Amino acid sequence: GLIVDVNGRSHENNLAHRTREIDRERLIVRRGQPFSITLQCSDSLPPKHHLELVLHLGKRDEVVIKVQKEHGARDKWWFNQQGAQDEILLTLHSPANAVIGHYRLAVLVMSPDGHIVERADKISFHMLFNPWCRDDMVYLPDESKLQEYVMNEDGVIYMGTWDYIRSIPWNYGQFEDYVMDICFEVLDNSPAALKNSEMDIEHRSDPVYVGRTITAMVNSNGDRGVLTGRWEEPYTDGVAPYRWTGSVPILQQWSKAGVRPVKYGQCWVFAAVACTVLRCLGIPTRPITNFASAHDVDGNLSVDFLLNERLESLDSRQRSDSSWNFHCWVESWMSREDLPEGNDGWQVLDPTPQELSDGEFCCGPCPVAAIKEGNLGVKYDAPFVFAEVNADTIYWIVQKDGQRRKITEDHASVGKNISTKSVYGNHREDVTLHYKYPEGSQKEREVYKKAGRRVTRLQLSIKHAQPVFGTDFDVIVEVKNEGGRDAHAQLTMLAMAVTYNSLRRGECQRKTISVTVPAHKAHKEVMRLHYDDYVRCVSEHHLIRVKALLDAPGPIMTVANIPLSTPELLVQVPGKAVVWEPLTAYVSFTNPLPVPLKGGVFTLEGAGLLSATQIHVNGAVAPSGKVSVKLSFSPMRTGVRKLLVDFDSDRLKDVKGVTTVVVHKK
């Protein structure tokens, strides 16, 4: 009868555990780090009476831990008890291999004979990974990187083409309301948890297991996964992937709907959502983007790509055109005690199912080091991840008489400018060398040799002035003869619309010329692409793949992907911003299309600023007319925050904007 109320001191514990952004009113703790709560008593522990503590995990007590009285093991939970005044200070010490999850704490007061004389109200708390605790497997010994890879809620995911990289800001929002609760829900709806709940809980102490589970639930899991993938345009009953500016709306939707795959997502949306959840649970994570991605190859390090003389895949039915313009995945920091010495550090987790086992096989965790050094023998999915960044595709002109002509290509190579956001600033950090030895290096030769990667004048090149969607433009194809004698050759050029995942769409023009380019001189040919022609074939990403063949008197090829730009939203939220103080944000742009756009919707969101919110343009924006809306709202948390905005319309899609707003109030 002595315990009047247990006090978790969450405002305090949560501050110490870097979990208070999530919530202050409930105890959210990290493992391997102690936490202190108090027992407010009415009087005193009856003479020969002592305290007992037992922990409960699982909706059905799948796991119960009796916490030690003191000097405990190292991987053993234990507590220290001390009296303050009219309350008892209980400092709980958890092992660094503690199971993450929602615990319910039962403090028992007992008779000296072995019987419970009273039991206090079972209070619950959540436990996350602790990369700041040196004994934790996710330990990262640099506080500045944990701030970006765990604590930062605003990221930048790179896209576009390797020679023309674009950035799209993303609101990971891992500390937005309830996103933590949904993260444990994703773990609770997985096959393993459904099949055997208790064993699954027991495995939740492992960053490898939990990382592989989250990566699997984001998309590959078809009945309860988080997102439904749709690789092409008619996104009939859902949101198009290029619409999202953050992960929280997808997660709230998935849970709100009773755990129901969200329509729809594409590779970078799976990675960003994976990032939000792993960062939330405490595993250091960063979205990485690969340009010229050998995703399509399905693990094969050698592909000969047969084209006909008209420069086309031999089978008219097949729509895929080799390597993706880019492809995204995620890198998570953790030590790999499940593998030989040396694979510790960043692991590649690819939520995007692998090509040829239909939306079934996600990738990783795979040591990025196993990729660099070519060890395809470690779990998980090293061959597939090594192919993604190393596969060798050789194109061939096969004639109607079976003669195969090898196309020489200058543009070549896969895994071009592997990028991730910079820890300081929003700069692109080229992370390629973490993945591969420089091209041609003898080091590259001996790894390709080890792993099975095959290991093997006129100059063709395509150039453009970065066109804006809506305009007709020219693209130059220049043949440089840096030889001594004159050279006459046949120059074939085509321009076809494409999707980032290399899905061939509309061949909006071809052309073959006969050329004689003189020694040390260069011939420049132009191809004029027009709006009314390419609106017909281009998609939400507005991409045009230009190719040029130069049958050199073997044949020479060069491909270029042209991403046509959309206007950039002007986002402004003027005057000093203060928490819980109403403010007005202003977004505006000018229709670059000589067509009216209707169905204009602006969607706004920001971690700590506001949850996705829509502004419907009433009417239709006239051709070349300026659009201008505004929304009022009151920031939720203080800090340097980023406001994200998306604009969609019938004729203008994929239009973004971001602004930095410093939220005050000391």
Side-chain angles (χ1 to χ4, degrees), residues 493-549:
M493 325 165 228
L494 325 61
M496 82 211 47
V498 111
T499 66
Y500 95 95
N501 51 144
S502 283
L503 238 30
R504 199 193 60 235
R505 272 170 74 86
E507 159 78 59
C508 40
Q509 96 185 241
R510 177 195 285 255
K511 174 185 183 228
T512 283
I513 237 60
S514 260
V515 118
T516 186
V517 188
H520 319 119
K521 241 58 181 202
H523 167 90
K524 294 199 209 168
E525 265 272 271
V526 173
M527 175 169 0
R528 179 153 185 99
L529 278 316
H530 303 86
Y531 179 62
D532 23 286
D533 282 338
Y534 72 60
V535 231
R536 264 118 75 175
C537 338
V538 124
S539 249
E540 63 252 13
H541 280 0
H542 326 267
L543 286 159
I544 285 164
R545 193 168 282 183
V546 179
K547 306 183 176 195
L549 216 255

Short mmCIF file of all heavy atoms in Angstrom, two decimals, residues 493-549:
data_model
loop_
_atom_site.label_atom_id
_atom_site.label_comp_id
_atom_site.label_asym_id
_atom_site.label_seq_id
_atom_site.Cartn_x
_atom_site.Cartn_y
_atom_site.Cartn_z
N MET A 493 21.17 8.93 -85.74
CA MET A 493 20.75 9.57 -84.49
C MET A 493 19.28 9.33 -84.21
O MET A 493 18.46 9.41 -85.12
CB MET A 493 20.98 11.06 -84.55
CG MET A 493 22.19 11.46 -85.30
SD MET A 493 21.99 13.21 -85.60
CE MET A 493 22.37 13.33 -87.37
N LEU A 494 18.93 9.02 -82.97
CA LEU A 494 17.53 8.81 -82.60
C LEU A 494 17.25 9.54 -81.32
O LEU A 494 18.13 9.72 -80.50
CB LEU A 494 17.18 7.36 -82.32
CG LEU A 494 17.71 6.07 -82.94
CD1 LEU A 494 19.22 5.89 -82.75
CD2 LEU A 494 16.92 4.93 -82.24
N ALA A 495 16.01 9.90 -81.11
CA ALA A 495 15.63 10.57 -79.90
C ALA A 495 14.29 9.94 -79.53
O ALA A 495 13.32 10.05 -80.28
CB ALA A 495 15.50 12.04 -80.16
N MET A 496 14.25 9.25 -78.39
CA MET A 496 13.04 8.58 -77.94
C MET A 496 12.79 8.95 -76.51
O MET A 496 13.74 9.17 -75.78
CB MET A 496 13.23 7.08 -78.01
CG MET A 496 13.95 6.55 -76.80
SD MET A 496 14.97 5.10 -77.14
CE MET A 496 15.80 5.71 -78.63
N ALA A 497 11.53 9.00 -76.10
CA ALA A 497 11.20 9.32 -74.71
C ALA A 497 11.56 8.09 -73.88
O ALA A 497 11.61 6.96 -74.40
CB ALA A 497 9.74 9.65 -74.57
N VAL A 498 11.81 8.29 -72.59
CA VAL A 498 12.22 7.20 -71.69
C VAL A 498 11.74 7.44 -70.24
O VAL A 498 11.23 8.53 -69.90
CB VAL A 498 13.76 7.14 -71.73
CG1 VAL A 498 14.33 7.57 -70.43
CG2 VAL A 498 14.24 5.77 -72.12
N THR A 499 11.86 6.41 -69.40
CA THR A 499 11.50 6.54 -67.98
C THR A 499 12.81 6.37 -67.23
O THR A 499 13.77 5.80 -67.78
CB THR A 499 10.53 5.46 -67.45
OG1 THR A 499 11.17 4.18 -67.47
CG2 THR A 499 9.28 5.42 -68.27
N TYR A 500 12.88 6.84 -65.98
CA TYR A 500 14.15 6.70 -65.28
C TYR A 500 14.56 5.24 -65.24
O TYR A 500 15.73 4.95 -65.42
CB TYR A 500 14.12 7.32 -63.88
CG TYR A 500 13.81 6.39 -62.74
CD1 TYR A 500 14.82 5.79 -62.01
CD2 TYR A 500 12.49 6.17 -62.35
CE1 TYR A 500 14.53 4.98 -60.86
CE2 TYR A 500 12.19 5.37 -61.23
CZ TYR A 500 13.20 4.78 -60.49
OH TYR A 500 12.88 4.01 -59.39
N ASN A 501 13.62 4.31 -65.05
CA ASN A 501 14.03 2.91 -65.04
C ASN A 501 14.20 2.29 -66.41
O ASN A 501 13.99 1.10 -66.60
CB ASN A 501 13.14 2.00 -64.16
CG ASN A 501 11.68 2.12 -64.43
OD1 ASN A 501 10.97 1.13 -64.36
ND2 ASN A 501 11.20 3.30 -64.69
N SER A 502 14.61 3.11 -67.36
CA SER A 502 14.86 2.66 -68.72
C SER A 502 13.72 1.97 -69.48
O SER A 502 13.95 1.05 -70.26
CB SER A 502 16.09 1.75 -68.68
OG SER A 502 17.25 2.55 -68.59
N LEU A 503 12.49 2.41 -69.28
CA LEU A 503 11.37 1.84 -70.00
C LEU A 503 11.17 2.71 -71.21
O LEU A 503 10.71 3.84 -71.09
CB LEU A 503 10.11 1.89 -69.14
CG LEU A 503 9.31 0.64 -68.78
CD1 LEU A 503 10.18 -0.55 -68.70
CD2 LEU A 503 8.65 0.87 -67.47
N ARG A 504 11.52 2.19 -72.37
CA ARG A 504 11.37 2.88 -73.65
C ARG A 504 9.90 3.25 -73.88
O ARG A 504 9.01 2.44 -73.65
CB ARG A 504 11.87 1.96 -74.75
CG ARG A 504 12.20 2.68 -76.03
CD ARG A 504 12.39 1.68 -77.20
NE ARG A 504 11.20 0.87 -77.48
CZ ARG A 504 11.17 -0.47 -77.50
NH1 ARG A 504 12.29 -1.17 -77.26
NH2 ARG A 504 10.03 -1.10 -77.76
N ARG A 505 9.67 4.49 -74.31
CA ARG A 505 8.31 4.96 -74.53
C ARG A 505 8.02 5.41 -75.95
O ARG A 505 7.67 4.59 -76.81
CB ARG A 505 7.99 6.08 -73.56
CG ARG A 505 7.44 5.52 -72.25
CD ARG A 505 7.34 6.54 -71.17
NE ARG A 505 6.23 7.45 -71.37
CZ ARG A 505 5.00 7.20 -70.96
NH1 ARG A 505 4.74 6.05 -70.35
NH2 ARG A 505 4.02 8.07 -71.18
N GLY A 506 8.15 6.70 -76.22
CA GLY A 506 7.89 7.16 -77.57
C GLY A 506 9.06 7.65 -78.43
O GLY A 506 9.67 8.69 -78.13
N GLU A 507 9.36 6.92 -79.51
CA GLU A 507 10.45 7.28 -80.43
C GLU A 507 10.07 8.57 -81.17
O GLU A 507 9.58 8.53 -82.30
CB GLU A 507 10.68 6.13 -81.43
CG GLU A 507 11.39 6.51 -82.73
CD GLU A 507 12.90 6.66 -82.57
OE1 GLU A 507 13.59 5.68 -82.17
OE2 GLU A 507 13.39 7.77 -82.87
N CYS A 508 10.30 9.73 -80.54
CA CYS A 508 9.94 10.99 -81.17
C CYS A 508 10.86 11.57 -82.25
O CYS A 508 10.95 12.80 -82.38
CB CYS A 508 9.65 12.07 -80.11
SG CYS A 508 10.74 12.08 -78.74
N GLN A 509 11.55 10.68 -82.98
CA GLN A 509 12.40 11.02 -84.13
C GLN A 509 13.77 10.42 -84.26
O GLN A 509 14.54 10.37 -83.32
CB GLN A 509 12.50 12.53 -84.34
CG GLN A 509 13.68 13.21 -83.75
CD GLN A 509 13.56 14.70 -83.94
OE1 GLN A 509 14.41 15.32 -84.59
NE2 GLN A 509 12.50 15.30 -83.39
N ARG A 510 14.05 9.99 -85.48
CA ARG A 510 15.30 9.34 -85.88
C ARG A 510 15.88 10.06 -87.11
O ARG A 510 15.20 10.91 -87.71
CB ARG A 510 14.96 7.89 -86.18
CG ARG A 510 16.07 7.05 -86.67
CD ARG A 510 15.48 5.79 -87.25
NE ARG A 510 15.03 4.88 -86.20
CZ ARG A 510 15.68 3.78 -85.86
NH1 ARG A 510 16.81 3.45 -86.48
NH2 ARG A 510 15.19 3.01 -84.90
N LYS A 511 17.11 9.75 -87.51
CA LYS A 511 17.71 10.45 -88.66
C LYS A 511 19.10 9.91 -88.93
O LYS A 511 19.90 9.78 -88.01
CB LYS A 511 17.79 11.95 -88.31
CG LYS A 511 18.51 12.88 -89.27
CD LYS A 511 18.55 14.28 -88.62
CE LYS A 511 19.18 15.37 -89.48
NZ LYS A 511 20.18 16.17 -88.68
N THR A 512 19.40 9.58 -90.18
CA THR A 512 20.72 9.09 -90.52
C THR A 512 21.37 10.00 -91.54
O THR A 512 20.75 10.38 -92.52
CB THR A 512 20.68 7.69 -91.10
OG1 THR A 512 20.49 6.76 -90.04
CG2 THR A 512 22.00 7.37 -91.79
N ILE A 513 22.62 10.36 -91.29
CA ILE A 513 23.33 11.26 -92.17
C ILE A 513 24.60 10.61 -92.62
O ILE A 513 25.08 9.67 -92.00
CB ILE A 513 23.69 12.58 -91.44
CG1 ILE A 513 23.12 13.76 -92.22
CG2 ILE A 513 25.21 12.73 -91.29
CD1 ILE A 513 21.61 13.73 -92.37
N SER A 514 25.13 11.11 -93.72
CA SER A 514 26.40 10.61 -94.22
C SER A 514 27.35 11.74 -93.91
O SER A 514 27.06 12.91 -94.17
CB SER A 514 26.36 10.32 -95.71
OG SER A 514 26.18 8.93 -95.92
N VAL A 515 28.48 11.37 -93.34
CA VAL A 515 29.41 12.37 -92.90
C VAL A 515 30.84 12.15 -93.38
O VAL A 515 31.28 11.00 -93.56
CB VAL A 515 29.33 12.40 -91.33
CG1 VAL A 515 30.63 12.04 -90.67
CG2 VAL A 515 28.84 13.73 -90.87
N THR A 516 31.54 13.25 -93.67
CA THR A 516 32.97 13.14 -93.98
C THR A 516 33.59 14.24 -93.15
O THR A 516 33.40 15.43 -93.40
CB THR A 516 33.36 13.34 -95.48
OG1 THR A 516 34.77 13.05 -95.62
CG2 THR A 516 33.04 14.75 -95.96
N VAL A 517 34.27 13.82 -92.09
CA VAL A 517 34.88 14.77 -91.22
C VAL A 517 36.37 14.68 -91.41
O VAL A 517 36.98 13.63 -91.32
CB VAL A 517 34.48 14.49 -89.79
CG1 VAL A 517 34.98 15.62 -88.91
CG2 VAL A 517 32.97 14.38 -89.71
N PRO A 518 36.98 15.82 -91.71
CA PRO A 518 38.40 16.01 -91.96
C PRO A 518 39.29 15.88 -90.76
O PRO A 518 38.87 16.11 -89.63
CB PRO A 518 38.46 17.40 -92.55
CG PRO A 518 37.01 17.82 -92.77
CD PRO A 518 36.21 17.07 -91.83
N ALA A 519 40.56 15.54 -91.02
CA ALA A 519 41.52 15.39 -89.96
C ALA A 519 41.45 16.58 -89.07
O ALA A 519 41.20 17.72 -89.51
CB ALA A 519 42.92 15.26 -90.53
N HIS A 520 41.67 16.31 -87.80
CA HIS A 520 41.66 17.32 -86.76
C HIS A 520 40.60 18.38 -86.88
O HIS A 520 40.84 19.52 -86.54
CB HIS A 520 43.02 17.95 -86.69
CG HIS A 520 44.11 16.95 -86.81
ND1 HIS A 520 45.04 16.97 -87.82
CD2 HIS A 520 44.41 15.87 -86.05
CE1 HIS A 520 45.86 15.95 -87.69
NE2 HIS A 520 45.51 15.27 -86.62
N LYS A 521 39.43 17.99 -87.35
CA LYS A 521 38.32 18.91 -87.45
C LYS A 521 37.14 18.16 -86.88
O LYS A 521 37.23 16.96 -86.70
CB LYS A 521 38.09 19.28 -88.91
CG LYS A 521 38.27 20.79 -89.20
CD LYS A 521 39.66 21.33 -88.82
CE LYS A 521 39.78 22.84 -89.09
NZ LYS A 521 41.20 23.30 -89.23
N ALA A 522 36.05 18.84 -86.57
CA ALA A 522 34.87 18.17 -85.99
C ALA A 522 33.56 18.56 -86.64
O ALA A 522 33.27 19.75 -86.80
CB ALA A 522 34.79 18.45 -84.48
N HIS A 523 32.75 17.57 -86.99
CA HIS A 523 31.44 17.81 -87.61
C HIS A 523 30.32 17.85 -86.56
O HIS A 523 30.17 16.93 -85.77
CB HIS A 523 31.15 16.72 -88.65
CG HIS A 523 29.73 16.69 -89.12
ND1 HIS A 523 29.28 17.42 -90.20
CD2 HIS A 523 28.65 16.02 -88.66
CE1 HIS A 523 27.99 17.21 -90.38
NE2 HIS A 523 27.58 16.36 -89.46
N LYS A 524 29.55 18.92 -86.57
CA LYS A 524 28.44 19.06 -85.64
C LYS A 524 27.08 19.01 -86.33
O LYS A 524 26.78 19.84 -87.18
CB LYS A 524 28.54 20.38 -84.89
CG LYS A 524 29.73 20.49 -83.95
CD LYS A 524 29.47 21.60 -82.93
CE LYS A 524 30.75 22.27 -82.44
NZ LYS A 524 30.47 23.53 -81.67
N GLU A 525 26.26 18.03 -85.95
CA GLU A 525 24.92 17.89 -86.49
C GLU A 525 23.94 18.21 -85.39
O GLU A 525 24.21 17.97 -84.21
CB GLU A 525 24.67 16.46 -86.98
CG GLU A 525 24.93 16.27 -88.46
CD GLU A 525 23.72 16.58 -89.31
OE1 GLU A 525 22.91 15.66 -89.56
OE2 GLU A 525 23.59 17.75 -89.73
N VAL A 526 22.80 18.77 -85.77
CA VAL A 526 21.77 19.14 -84.83
C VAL A 526 20.46 18.37 -85.01
O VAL A 526 20.07 17.98 -86.12
CB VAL A 526 21.47 20.65 -84.93
CG1 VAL A 526 20.28 21.01 -84.08
CG2 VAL A 526 22.70 21.44 -84.51
N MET A 527 19.79 18.12 -83.89
CA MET A 527 18.51 17.44 -83.92
C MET A 527 17.59 18.33 -83.14
O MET A 527 17.84 18.59 -81.97
CB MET A 527 18.63 16.08 -83.25
CG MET A 527 17.32 15.32 -83.11
SD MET A 527 17.62 13.60 -82.60
CE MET A 527 19.45 13.59 -82.48
N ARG A 528 16.54 18.81 -83.77
CA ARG A 528 15.63 19.68 -83.06
C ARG A 528 14.42 18.95 -82.58
O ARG A 528 13.63 18.46 -83.38
CB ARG A 528 15.18 20.84 -83.93
CG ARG A 528 14.21 21.77 -83.23
CD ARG A 528 14.30 23.18 -83.80
NE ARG A 528 13.44 24.11 -83.07
CZ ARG A 528 13.87 24.93 -82.11
NH1 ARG A 528 15.15 24.95 -81.77
NH2 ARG A 528 13.01 25.75 -81.51
N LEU A 529 14.30 18.86 -81.25
CA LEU A 529 13.17 18.21 -80.61
C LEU A 529 12.15 19.32 -80.32
O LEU A 529 12.55 20.43 -79.94
CB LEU A 529 13.64 17.53 -79.33
CG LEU A 529 14.30 16.15 -79.43
CD1 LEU A 529 13.55 15.25 -80.37
CD2 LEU A 529 15.69 16.32 -79.89
N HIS A 530 10.85 19.03 -80.52
CA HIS A 530 9.77 20.01 -80.32
C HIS A 530 8.74 19.59 -79.30
O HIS A 530 8.38 18.42 -79.21
CB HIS A 530 9.01 20.25 -81.62
CG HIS A 530 9.88 20.71 -82.74
ND1 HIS A 530 10.56 19.84 -83.56
CD2 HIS A 530 10.17 21.95 -83.18
CE1 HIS A 530 11.23 20.53 -84.46
NE2 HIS A 530 11.01 21.81 -84.26
N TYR A 531 8.21 20.56 -78.59
CA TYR A 531 7.26 20.27 -77.56
C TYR A 531 6.09 19.44 -77.98
O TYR A 531 5.85 18.40 -77.40
CB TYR A 531 6.75 21.55 -76.93
CG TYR A 531 5.73 21.27 -75.86
CD1 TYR A 531 6.07 20.54 -74.72
CD2 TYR A 531 4.42 21.73 -75.97
CE1 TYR A 531 5.14 20.28 -73.72
CE2 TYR A 531 3.47 21.47 -74.97
CZ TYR A 531 3.84 20.74 -73.85
OH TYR A 531 2.91 20.46 -72.88
N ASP A 532 5.35 19.89 -78.98
CA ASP A 532 4.14 19.17 -79.42
C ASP A 532 4.42 17.77 -79.91
O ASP A 532 3.50 16.98 -80.08
CB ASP A 532 3.41 19.96 -80.50
CG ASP A 532 4.33 20.92 -81.23
OD1 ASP A 532 4.69 21.95 -80.62
OD2 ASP A 532 4.68 20.63 -82.40
N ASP A 533 5.69 17.47 -80.12
CA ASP A 533 6.09 16.14 -80.54
C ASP A 533 6.35 15.32 -79.28
O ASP A 533 5.74 14.28 -79.06
CB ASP A 533 7.39 16.18 -81.37
CG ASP A 533 7.18 16.64 -82.82
OD1 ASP A 533 6.04 16.52 -83.34
OD2 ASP A 533 8.17 17.10 -83.44
N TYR A 534 7.26 15.80 -78.43
CA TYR A 534 7.59 15.05 -77.23
C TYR A 534 6.61 15.07 -76.08
O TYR A 534 6.80 14.30 -75.16
CB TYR A 534 9.02 15.34 -76.69
CG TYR A 534 9.27 16.69 -76.04
CD1 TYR A 534 8.56 17.10 -74.90
CD2 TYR A 534 10.17 17.59 -76.60
CE1 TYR A 534 8.74 18.35 -74.36
CE2 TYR A 534 10.35 18.85 -76.08
CZ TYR A 534 9.63 19.23 -74.96
OH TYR A 534 9.76 20.53 -74.50
N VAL A 535 5.57 15.91 -76.11
CA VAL A 535 4.62 15.86 -74.99
C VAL A 535 3.91 14.53 -75.07
O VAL A 535 3.47 13.97 -74.08
CB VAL A 535 3.48 16.85 -75.09
CG1 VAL A 535 3.37 17.62 -73.81
CG2 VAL A 535 3.64 17.71 -76.29
N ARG A 536 3.80 14.05 -76.30
CA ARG A 536 3.13 12.80 -76.59
C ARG A 536 3.76 11.55 -75.95
O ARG A 536 3.05 10.66 -75.51
CB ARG A 536 3.05 12.63 -78.13
CG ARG A 536 1.73 13.09 -78.77
CD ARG A 536 1.94 14.23 -79.75
NE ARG A 536 2.52 13.77 -81.00
CZ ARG A 536 2.72 14.53 -82.08
NH1 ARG A 536 2.37 15.82 -82.06
NH2 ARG A 536 3.29 14.03 -83.17
N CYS A 537 5.09 11.52 -75.84
CA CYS A 537 5.79 10.33 -75.35
C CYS A 537 6.46 10.39 -73.98
O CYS A 537 6.67 9.38 -73.32
CB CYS A 537 6.83 9.91 -76.40
SG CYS A 537 6.54 10.51 -78.15
N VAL A 538 6.81 11.59 -73.57
CA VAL A 538 7.50 11.83 -72.32
C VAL A 538 6.57 11.62 -71.12
O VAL A 538 5.36 11.72 -71.27
CB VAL A 538 8.12 13.23 -72.42
CG1 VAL A 538 7.68 14.11 -71.32
CG2 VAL A 538 9.59 13.11 -72.53
N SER A 539 7.15 11.27 -69.96
CA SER A 539 6.44 11.00 -68.67
C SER A 539 6.65 12.11 -67.62
O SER A 539 7.20 13.17 -67.92
CB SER A 539 6.99 9.70 -68.05
OG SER A 539 6.05 8.65 -68.08
N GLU A 540 6.24 11.83 -66.38
CA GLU A 540 6.36 12.78 -65.28
C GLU A 540 7.79 13.28 -65.06
O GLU A 540 7.98 14.36 -64.51
CB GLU A 540 5.89 12.13 -63.99
CG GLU A 540 6.75 10.95 -63.60
CD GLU A 540 6.05 9.62 -63.80
OE1 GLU A 540 4.99 9.58 -64.48
OE2 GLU A 540 6.58 8.62 -63.28
N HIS A 541 8.78 12.51 -65.49
CA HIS A 541 10.17 12.93 -65.32
C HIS A 541 10.66 13.68 -66.54
O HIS A 541 11.76 14.20 -66.55
CB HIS A 541 11.10 11.72 -65.02
CG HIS A 541 11.07 11.27 -63.57
ND1 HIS A 541 10.30 11.87 -62.60
CD2 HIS A 541 11.70 10.24 -62.96
CE1 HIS A 541 10.45 11.23 -61.45
NE2 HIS A 541 11.29 10.23 -61.64
N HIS A 542 9.85 13.75 -67.59
CA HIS A 542 10.26 14.49 -68.79
C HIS A 542 11.65 14.13 -69.33
O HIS A 542 12.50 15.02 -69.52
CB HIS A 542 10.21 16.01 -68.50
CG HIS A 542 9.11 16.41 -67.56
ND1 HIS A 542 7.87 16.81 -68.00
CD2 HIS A 542 9.06 16.43 -66.21
CE1 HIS A 542 7.09 17.06 -66.96
NE2 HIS A 542 7.79 16.84 -65.86
N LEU A 543 11.88 12.85 -69.60
CA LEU A 543 13.17 12.36 -70.09
C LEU A 543 13.26 11.96 -71.57
O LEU A 543 12.39 11.26 -72.11
CB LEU A 543 13.59 11.16 -69.26
CG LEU A 543 14.11 11.33 -67.84
CD1 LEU A 543 13.92 9.98 -67.16
CD2 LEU A 543 15.59 11.79 -67.83
N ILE A 544 14.34 12.35 -72.23
CA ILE A 544 14.54 12.01 -73.62
C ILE A 544 15.91 11.38 -73.79
O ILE A 544 16.93 12.04 -73.59
CB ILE A 544 14.40 13.27 -74.51
CG1 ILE A 544 12.91 13.65 -74.63
CG2 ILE A 544 15.00 13.02 -75.90
CD1 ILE A 544 12.67 15.03 -75.13
N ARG A 545 15.94 10.12 -74.16
CA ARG A 545 17.21 9.45 -74.36
C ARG A 545 17.67 9.64 -75.81
O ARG A 545 17.01 9.18 -76.72
CB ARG A 545 17.06 7.97 -74.07
CG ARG A 545 18.36 7.20 -73.94
CD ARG A 545 18.06 5.84 -73.35
NE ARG A 545 17.85 5.90 -71.91
CZ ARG A 545 17.61 4.84 -71.14
NH1 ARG A 545 17.56 3.63 -71.68
NH2 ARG A 545 17.43 5.00 -69.83
N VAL A 546 18.78 10.34 -76.02
CA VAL A 546 19.31 10.55 -77.36
C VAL A 546 20.46 9.58 -77.56
O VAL A 546 21.27 9.40 -76.65
CB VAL A 546 19.83 11.97 -77.54
CG1 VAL A 546 20.42 12.16 -78.93
CG2 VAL A 546 18.70 12.96 -77.28
N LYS A 547 20.52 8.93 -78.73
CA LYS A 547 21.59 7.98 -79.05
C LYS A 547 22.24 8.31 -80.39
O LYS A 547 21.60 8.82 -81.29
CB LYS A 547 21.06 6.56 -79.11
CG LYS A 547 20.32 6.14 -77.86
CD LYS A 547 19.89 4.68 -77.97
CE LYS A 547 19.23 4.19 -76.70
NZ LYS A 547 19.16 2.71 -76.73
N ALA A 548 23.51 8.03 -80.53
CA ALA A 548 24.13 8.33 -81.80
C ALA A 548 25.03 7.17 -82.11
O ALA A 548 25.70 6.64 -81.22
CB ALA A 548 24.93 9.62 -81.71
N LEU A 549 25.00 6.73 -83.36
CA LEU A 549 25.82 5.61 -83.81
C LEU A 549 26.70 6.21 -84.89
O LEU A 549 26.24 7.02 -85.68
CB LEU A 549 24.95 4.52 -84.43
CG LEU A 549 25.26 3.04 -84.27
CD1 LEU A 549 25.80 2.53 -85.56
CD2 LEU A 549 26.20 2.80 -83.11
#
